[PDB]
Amino acid sequence: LHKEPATLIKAIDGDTDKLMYKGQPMTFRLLLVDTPEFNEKYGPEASAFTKKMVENAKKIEVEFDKGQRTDKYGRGLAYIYADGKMVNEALVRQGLAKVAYVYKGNNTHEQLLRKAEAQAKKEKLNIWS
Numbered sequence: 001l002h003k004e005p006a007t008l009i010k011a012i013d014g015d016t017d018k019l020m021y022k023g024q025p026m027t028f029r030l031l032l033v034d035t036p037e038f039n040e041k042y043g044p045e046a047s048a049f050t051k052k053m054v055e056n057a058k059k060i061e062v063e064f065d066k067g068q069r070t071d072k073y074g075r076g077l078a079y080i081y082a083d084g085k086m087v088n089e090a091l092v093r094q095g096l097a098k099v100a101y102v103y104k105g106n107n108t109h110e111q112l113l114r115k116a117e118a119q120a121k122k123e124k125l126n127i128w129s
């Protein structure tokens, strides 16, 4: 896999946001995770966590997996990095997302994320409290 450039257009919620990729606006959905919706417990906290991490970054990058790059809603499916730190992993490590939607052929970072989830669960963080 490889990282490609993008810039923030607007935060949306814990696992989606609007980025400019190859000069076009796209909604991206984070691979392999599921944050609560804004109206749900920890939803505001997931939204705030992703918003801060992406808005404070000097450099945003997107990394597509080996499979599908857009979902049935036209959202890009990627691992998003903020100054080299993976947003998907950081949400899971903080107990603000669960590992979820693991489809075969777009699952390169599954084990990295399950290790973060085990750590968040051991710590009883947030969703795991």
Ligand SMILES: Cc1cn([C@H]2C[C@H](OP(=O)(O)O)[C@@H](COP(=O)(O)O)O2)c(=O)[nH]c1=O
Residues within 6 Å of the ligand: 029, 030, 031, 032, 033, 034, 071, 072, 077, 101, 103
């Ligand atoms: C994360 C992800 C979601 N999706 C689809 C599955 C779910 O379909 P349904 O909308 O039919 O439930 C939806 C979950 O996204 P949200 O968690 O953003 O709602 O997005 C993919 O198809 N591929 C993916 O990698």
Ligand SMILES: [Ca+2]
Residues within 6 Å of the ligand: 015, 034, 035, 036, 037
């Ligand atoms: Ca969600």
